[PDB]
Structures are given as C-alpha cells and as structure tokens.
Design a protein around this nucleic acid. Sequence first.
RNA 1: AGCGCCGCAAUUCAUGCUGCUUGCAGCCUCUGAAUUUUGAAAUGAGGGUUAGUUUGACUGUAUAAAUACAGUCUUGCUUUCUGACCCUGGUAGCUGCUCCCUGAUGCUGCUGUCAAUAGACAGGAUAGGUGCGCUCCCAGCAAUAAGGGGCGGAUGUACUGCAGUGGCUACUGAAUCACCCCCGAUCAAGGGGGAACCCUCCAAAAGGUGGGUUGAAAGGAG
Length: 454
Amino acid sequence: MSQITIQARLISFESNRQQLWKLMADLNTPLINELLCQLGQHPDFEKWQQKGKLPSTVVSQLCQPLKTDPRFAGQPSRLYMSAIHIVDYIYKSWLAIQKRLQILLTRSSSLPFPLVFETNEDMVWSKNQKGRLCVHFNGLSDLIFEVYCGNRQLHWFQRFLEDQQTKRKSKNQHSSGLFTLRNGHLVWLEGEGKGEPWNLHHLTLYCCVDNRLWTEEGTEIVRQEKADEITKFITNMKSDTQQALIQRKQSTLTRINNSFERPSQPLYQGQSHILVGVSLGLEKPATVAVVDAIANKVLAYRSIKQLLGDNYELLNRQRRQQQYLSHERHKAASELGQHIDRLLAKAIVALARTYKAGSIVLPKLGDMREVVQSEIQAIAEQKFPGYIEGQQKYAKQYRVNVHRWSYGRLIQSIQSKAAQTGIVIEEGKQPIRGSPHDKAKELALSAYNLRLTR
RNA sequence: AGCGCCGCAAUUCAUGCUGCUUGCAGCCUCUGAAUUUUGAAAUGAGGGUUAGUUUGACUGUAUAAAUACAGUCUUGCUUUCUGACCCUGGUAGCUGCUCCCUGAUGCUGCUGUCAAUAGACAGGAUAGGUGCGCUCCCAGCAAUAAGGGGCGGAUGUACUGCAGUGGCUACUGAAUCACCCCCGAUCAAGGGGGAACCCUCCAAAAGGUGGGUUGAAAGGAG
C-alpha cells in the first residue's frame, strides 16, 4: 500500500524529442480524446454511472480495432495498453469524485497526455560512456534517453541498474516480480519560452517504488508474503490456462528463493503496549501524547510548538496566507500547507521512533467536523461566561481570523510516513471539552482499549 | 475599544532536574503548557531572478538501540523559509460596465521636489496603526436595481445622457545570482582567479602548501 515517487528529467537529442512529440501529440492525444468521446456516447455509460468501477476487458475489446487504423498505424501495442490504462484511471477517478459529490466532461491543455508502464521488464537501463544512467524502453529501443536527478534520487536508479545487471548475469534465474519498480509515468512540465515545441517543453519520468524493497529485511518479508500467498492459492486450487498458470507460479516460487545482493539494515519492531496518540485541534492544531497504555502514567507530552524545530513561524505564515486566500475567494496558492503537513509527519514519526513506539492513533476525518465545532463552542464559553451574543461574536471572529488546517493532507502524510517507517496506524473517537493534550491522551487510551477488545 | 499572533515578569504544572522509594519529596539551571499586565524580545513585508547549499546512498566500529566516527560514489527532479538585485511600467490591438442621495461591499493611502486640485521627477518598500497582520475600524473614491429622488431627447413604459473603469496577447528587461567575478552552454561540460574565518605542515615571523566553512529544510504521483 506504500509507494514512493521518484522524479527525473530526460535529456536527448533534438531529433529524438521531435520523434517522440510527433508520436504522442498527433497519435496518442487524439486516441485519448476519441475514446473519451466514445465512452461518453457508449450506450452502457448510463449503466456504468451507477457503479464506480470499470473493467479493462471491455475497454480493450472496444479499443483493439484502432491498432490497424491507418491514422494510428505506427505505434507499439504497449503504448496502446498504456493509453487504455490511462483512460481507465481517469474514468475511475471521475466516478470516484462523482460519487463523493453525490454530459461532455472533456477538458483540454497544451502538454500531451502521459505514457504509463505497469511492467518492469520492458524498461531497460544502461551505463553511458560518460557515466550517466541511460534508459531505453522496450520498443523504439534504438533511441537513447539520459536521466538527470538529484542526490536523494540517484541511488534508486543505481539499484535499478544493479537489479538489471543481476537479472541479466544470472541467466534470468532471479524473480522479476521482486524488483522495486511498480509504475512508470512519462509526462512533460510545460517549458516556458518560445521556439520549437519539442525543444521547449521538458520531459520527465516518475518511478513508483516500494519502501519494503530498499532494505534486506523488507525483501525477506515481501518474498515470504508472496510465497505464502502462492502456496495458499495453490492449496485452495488443490483447464490449460490454469495449468500453465500453476507452473508459472511454481517457477516464480523457485525464482524467489534466490537472494539479491542488497544492504542489510536492522528492522524496527515497536512495542505493542506502547502507544502514541495525536489530537487535531484549532488553537493547538496538533498535540502528541506518548503513553505506556498499561499504567496511567504518560511518558511524553508534546505541543506543536516543540514539534517544529525553528519552524514555528511557518504555521503563522500559512494561517495568514489561508486567511488572505479566503478573503480573495470571498471577493469573487503557494502549497505551503502540504509542506507543513509533511514536516509534521516527519516530526511525529521521529518522535515515535525516539520512544520506541509502534502504534499511533489519529482522529477520523469524517466525524471530526463536529469536534471542531464543539471546540469552537467550548472556547466561546471559555472566553465569555454566559451571554450568547458574546459567544456568537467570539465564534465569528475566531472563524474569520483562522480557518481549517487541511486535516486530510495531514492524515495522508502521517499514513505515508508511518508506512515508510513501519508504525501501525489506528483510529479512535476524539473526546469533547477537554485539554488538547488530555484529548490526545484520552484518544490513545481509547485506541488501546479498542485494540484490546478487537 | 474588541479579535488572532510573537515574547517580558511572576504563580502553578512537567513534558526538566536533584535521590532512587523507580514514583514518590523539593525546585525552575536548561526546555515546554495554563493564567493578569504592558506596549522589550520576536513574528511580520510585491513580482520574479539558479543545472542553487544542505536535508544523499553504500561498507565497518562503539552503542541492546537512537546517535557518533572512519572509507568510496555523487547529478542537475518538484517545493518551504531566509539573504541580495530592478520595479511599481513601454510599444500596438481586443474586451465587460456607466444624474444625485442614503447603504452591505470593494479600491487607495512609502519618502523629498515642481503644479493648492490632474501628472511627472529620484530614493526605496522599514507600503496609513497598538510589536505585526486581519471580511475590524481612519478619510476620500467606485460600483451594483440594495432602495429613494427626479429631468431632457425619445409617440413610446423600451433606449440614451444629466468622458472614466479592470482583464488578455508578441517584443522589450531587471535579477538567470546562495561568498563573489570571467568564459560558450542553459536538452547541457565545467574551468580559472579573488577577499574573510578555522585546523594541520613548512615557516623566528610575515607569507605559502593540504583540507573545511562561506544558510537551513520536505517529498507518493494523480
């Protein structure tokens, strides 16, 4: 469930970029547009409106005659299935957002639609004579691409090259599914300026990798899980296609037994009894309570001011920017909230790792709006005792001065960082009319009680 | 006057210390939370300017672990703050809305000089405020059928008045720099020299050789 996106820039000759632009803009983009129009006019679209799913079999069965079409004749079938995967993902996202919010539905832009790659054997690496990390995809392999990236992204490509060399050196005796690659995305970045379009817009690649494949212990865990799943499926099954499938599965099981030359790092196994709870508020948007959960003595209290080491002014800056943006919208973004959420996630994960924590609880996003409203109400009578005009005025002022804190982004960041480290994530009921530190402590004890009962 | 925010005193607490009784007694030396104060420490600023520095990876030793140290490679992807730079615009076109009063609401307000009133000339954002911003007030103005008061042309109840407003395109160009310059490149490859600090060696010393510092961070895409 955990994936990491690695970004890189692709540099090649002018003729190479010209060929790619002539191959995508004039072929793939009209492909995407025409299948979007076809599914819009497809008679089963109305039936598919009810259920938020779309199998790829029907899309392939409606798309394969375009392979031999004169306008779209020259293109690898891998790019065609990339296009159908892209349209499937886009339509699934459209169904998801329509169901969440519960025609033509076509928009346009300047950069060409991307290129996907689910399999990993097609994308092949090589070492340049200069020393760069060249990549050549399966199909049009005579055209070379140079990869450029930062210091914290080059070692993943080094591991990709090492995996390729190990695969080709051992006569393909190693497992292909054990590679760190998950997905590959080929996009552009809207290069500004004037001139030739192919020489103006940069080309970039995103590689989806798995956290549990970088270290050795993760690679033993994942191969043990895969072997257990394969054996369980075989015993469940214990028909030429199914037969060939079972020999392929046993062949992959044999391939798994071979070990990769990967670095060894000790695995983190947090204690089950130790708990960490995080409470999301407004006056104190994030509070942390590290509790033993066995005896009612709390190991650690942490307010948000201590979490951001020499970064507390960033919260005030983001609040001011949010207020200004709300005022601007009321008349008719720097994306700092994402950075603050990621900083908070890193700080909380570091705090949990310091205290040997293994379980952390977060409030649920859906039912915490009433929690925010009750916190506003509680601080309203906190400021003014009993005259309802005072509480109403204070609530209006406090709402206009400070707005929401983008809780869902924080939830996603915490989940991603915990999955990167290996800390269990739980949910619980946030209590009402209590101190935020006491709120976090009560949430942690409630989470421990729920885990004990369930 | 009131709202949020940064921190100064004092009280309490510990999420800190003193001892081990490993949860209890005391305290604020460091670090944080709650409470009255006030305008003495901090937050705070319009638009951009990089192949930007750092937060990297692997191999071992101390450490149960975090963490520190020694050896090798290195890269330019996307961002958050901070430091420095010019400026509040020019060339040509397109487009929305329009009498007085009372309004919710919105715009403006930096310094010195020529015209009291239109506009320019230079510096420069320490842009009108209690320490700073804010749908909040300080004056002017603007617009909307939010209402009232209408008048002329118009047979007409419809329409127009009683010269302004904001937005979009191609060039221009100011940064194209993280100590600062020069050289061709910004689909690509760096080199040379210079001023300041620290360590070691030569060196009575001056000075030179070898190394490091010339800011810190975050990243799963959609």
